[PDB]
Symmetry: D2
Amino acid sequence: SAVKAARYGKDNVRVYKVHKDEKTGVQTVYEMTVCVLLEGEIETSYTKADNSVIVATDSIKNTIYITAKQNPVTPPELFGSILGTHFIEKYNHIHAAHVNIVCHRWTRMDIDGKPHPHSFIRDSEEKRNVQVDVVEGKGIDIKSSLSGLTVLKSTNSQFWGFLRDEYTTLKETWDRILSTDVDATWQWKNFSGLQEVRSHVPKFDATWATAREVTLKTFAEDNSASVQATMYKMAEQILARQQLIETVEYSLPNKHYFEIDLSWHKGLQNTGKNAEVFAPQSDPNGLIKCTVGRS
Amino acid sequence: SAVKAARYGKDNVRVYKVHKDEKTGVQTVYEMTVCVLLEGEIETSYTKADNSVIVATDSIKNTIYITAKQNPVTPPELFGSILGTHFIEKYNHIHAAHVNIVCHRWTRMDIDGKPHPHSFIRDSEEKRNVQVDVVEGKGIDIKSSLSGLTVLKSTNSQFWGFLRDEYTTLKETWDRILSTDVDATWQWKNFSGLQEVRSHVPKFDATWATAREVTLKTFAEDNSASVQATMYKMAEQILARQQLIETVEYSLPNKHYFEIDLSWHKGLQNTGKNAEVFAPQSDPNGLIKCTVGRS
Amino acid sequence: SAVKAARYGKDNVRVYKVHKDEKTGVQTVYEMTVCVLLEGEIETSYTKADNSVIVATDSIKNTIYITAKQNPVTPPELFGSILGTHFIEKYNHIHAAHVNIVCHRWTRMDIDGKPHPHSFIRDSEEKRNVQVDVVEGKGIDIKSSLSGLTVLKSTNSQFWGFLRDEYTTLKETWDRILSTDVDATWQWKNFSGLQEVRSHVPKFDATWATAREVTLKTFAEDNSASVQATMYKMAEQILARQQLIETVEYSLPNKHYFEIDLSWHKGLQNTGKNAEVFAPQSDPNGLIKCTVGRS
Amino acid sequence: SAVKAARYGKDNVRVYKVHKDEKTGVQTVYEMTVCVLLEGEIETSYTKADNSVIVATDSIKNTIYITAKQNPVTPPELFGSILGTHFIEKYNHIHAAHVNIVCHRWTRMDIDGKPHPHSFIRDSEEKRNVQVDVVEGKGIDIKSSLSGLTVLKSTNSQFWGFLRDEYTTLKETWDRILSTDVDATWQWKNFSGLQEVRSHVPKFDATWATAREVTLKTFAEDNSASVQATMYKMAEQILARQQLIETVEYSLPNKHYFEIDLSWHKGLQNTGKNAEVFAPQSDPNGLIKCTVGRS
Ligand SMILES: O=c1[nH]c(=O)c2nn[nH]c2[nH]1
Ligand SMILES: O=c1[nH]c(=O)c2nn[nH]c2[nH]1
Ligand SMILES: O=c1[nH]c(=O)c2nn[nH]c2[nH]1
Ligand SMILES: O=c1[nH]c(=O)c2nn[nH]c2[nH]1
Ligand SMILES: [Cl-]
Ligand SMILES: [Cl-]
Ligand SMILES: [Cl-]
Ligand SMILES: [Cl-]
Ligand code: NA
Ligand code: NA
Ligand code: NA
Ligand code: NA
Ligand SMILES: [Xe]
Ligand SMILES: [Xe]
Ligand SMILES: [Xe]
Ligand SMILES: [Xe]
Ligand SMILES: [Xe]
Ligand SMILES: [Xe]
Ligand SMILES: [Xe]
Ligand SMILES: [Xe]
């Protein structure tokens, strides 16, 4: 037998950082969960019990805190690139670092119509994530994403003209509820190293904001022919607005809301144009994916 | 042996309702999870296998949908009271109904600075809940609550002057992070029946909004001496603003964020006034409760 | 305003303890999650910011570890009683302690048909729990429970003869699937203090084992007329077998498995006596409760 | 823009099937959660709103139930292969099917030392899974796995001789607790189609059982030098025992249990050889992966 692939590290490292502006008194907080996995010339720890090649996962944890102390943690694309680069430069035998960061929302509170200097609220479990792969001699690959963005529209979604055969019971519809949890990922062109990532720093937050805006606007405004057609429109627009993105991937559950026929009870009308009360279905759900790239 | 207490019903009934304004085209959605448990002269179903006394839980589920079809579902205090009353009036041998409702947020989307007519976002897992107990000959008891409101302040929290003995290691502090998930419940004076609940309908949404506002403002502005002292201030204010509330209960976890000493690494300073990077602790957590009533 | 009730403490304190037999080499592990909440003359911490009355929740955490170090942690009824008593004896102004313990399963592994001396498996998320309320001058109240015991029987469950009215669509059945997650609680007669709890130590594990055995046997053997009738039979037997129990409470979800009519597809027969493939329903579910005591 | 990749289908389809032996009266239940995603010539549904190419996800759901009705559901490797093949044979424009199955445990109950004919218990949340990729003209690729197998050993784990530098605080140890949740996957050699999968049917359950046995035995018996070294030993043995497996992958969290120094309290000794009470850590955790193949 032989080791074909190996990676190891620390997962679920929770980190909070505060920035205090001495002049204004304003404080800003950041909270993330970080995973770092390393690869390199480490096969002997598996095959020969040679621990001499292991950077202890506890040390990886220490390194995350130290790096957060000495560097900005925002945008997460930059922080992940700094953290990943550290490992491949510090350790001769480590040749790749894989860094995943989940950013948790802490939104500044408005009290009496003014922004509070040091109080925050978690408005939704929506996350902003990055995956950064730093590979020695191959640069830095960054995938940025938003996830956990849950939306619903109560009309202006249709689904008709699909294949019908002996397995089909679904009725065509010209008016249905559409609800989904959005997972959208944009993959950046490969960067040659940290200097190049630093040069593009302003694009990271701007592209995240654009991806979010395009997602919400397209969802709200499209008279949707299917989840497929609407998601493609979203991806198309993101690619048009940021030339440094190579691909956009969406993964969307179709969370069903079923009509409830109540006509058995005193002829009560609750279907089609009369539908007011629906039963949300926890499972099963549709799952629709697509990756859109350039011509 | 004897049946000392019994209740049965349907839990986890998900319900969505849409209201369509024909004039404006504006649609408004409501989504809830409902539990209804009944009590009454039902002992023989347990002791003698006499099902004749059982209103099937499946029928309870049907009744929830029918009631939502024929009545407003907002405010939830009113809907729960209508639903509970139905059971004690319809069935001679049922003498109490216990209705729990969890309301899920669907907030209208703003697209280009205007409110969208039919598109919604789930902004946070914060819930608005009601517990309604309808007891034949004893009226309607309503407890209203908000839960899952997660907040953090990065300074202006202290904790010193606590008891110190041979079990104590905790250092006094004049500056710490305070973060909690707020669960707040206000208990209404007993109502004589549905007519009285209807007469107070405008107070339900207003009191919820007040409870939320007071919670957020007090949290942000109090230079907190302890979770205990800050929560008492919140409850005091709510009671002062709504005379129909008899008691206010808060239950607050103290979600700890620990300093990380990094001085072992190149004398790095990250504690006390130099603290920037903290480790959020998933467990254990403090849990602090209080019920405040009138003199 | 006045403080009507208050309690505070530490939740989610995870504890592991190992016992090592020096002679045999056999090791036994215990793992629990503990919550301790205190009550007493502590109102001034809420109303006057007087922390002098607060035993810090961090100290409560330390006390749990120290107590586990110096005392047996099994049976949990005894450990909870020792822990609760500690607080009311040590602190003059604390008059009640409320201790909740969840015991996690670590079952010794069998390797090649022999019990391994130091290796364990988590066989199921079933828990054994205790709630211990130690109230100064009123003794020790103990509720013991098992929870998370998930079972299913594929036949020998019926449900017919229930009330039918204009809200009813459910068909009577003489053969259905019955599946539930068992939550069963037995409440001990009040104990005068720790000496009395110690005197009954052997009864705690034996009664837990009996409660489990009776639950499983009755479920498997009863030709069930309803969840109500079957659960009553369980409670009756437990009460008959342990005279020191005052009441037994069961809380049982009815987790539905629905027939799937496939006759639309090539006349395929999958209902009634021909039913083979079913759709488990995640929600809604029935919820059936009963508390059984002595004549 | 262009569609670079697309797949769509139904997730979270819960399925239960019962088999009734008419002779013995013995019933056997199977319960699974199934996901099916399709690929093929479906780009126009995304780009042109052409639904004519879409097999509705609702139809995919129907197909899962129909297929379960007409075929054995065990071993899951065979069922997944039947289900996947169905889609590529039935629909000209569908060229790949991806089927994921999670099998839930329903273990027959022993009542009074005999196996009960129709009553079952969920003993642990351990799962048996399959991923089946059926690609037109490229055969059937099957990855089988077990997951959620949670184990702990209280001694006979060491970790010393790792790299020490200015980022290292971890002390070497010759005696620690080792606890993990096992995720193990074995990848079968490519099969040419359903006939070949059918020919190997007996190997599927046998290899699952072997993988489980080897995992448990090696964990219990290895005097572990690291998670890395122990996991490699497991994978090596599985490969030696089944020649039709090409690779074995393990992914193992290292769930830490920390010593608690209690010496501050009356010189209490609870570290090193005196360690009895430990604090389980919910996060962070080590994460160690390896893929082992043949020379
Ligand atoms: O078994 C281990 N492997 C590792 O890589 C490691 N790092 N810290 N502790 C550890 N334990
Ligand atoms: O056992 C049952 N008890 C009930 O109360 C009920 N209601 N619907 N189905 C049911 N099954
Ligand atoms: O606000 C607090 N209240 C308490 O009771 C406590 N105990 N430890 N830290 C604490 N903080
Ligand atoms: O938007 C949809 N896309 C689909 O592929 C589908 N299948 N069923 N309903 C559906 N809705
Ligand atoms: Cl769908
Ligand atoms: Cl606390
Ligand atoms: Cl039910
Ligand atoms: Cl580790
Ligand atoms: Na390197
Ligand atoms: Na009545
Ligand atoms: Na006392
Ligand atoms: Na095909
Ligand atoms: Xe951070
Ligand atoms: Xe969408
Ligand atoms: Xe609703
Ligand atoms: Xe607070
Ligand atoms: Xe323990
Ligand atoms: Xe039951
Ligand atoms: Xe199944
Ligand atoms: Xe391991």
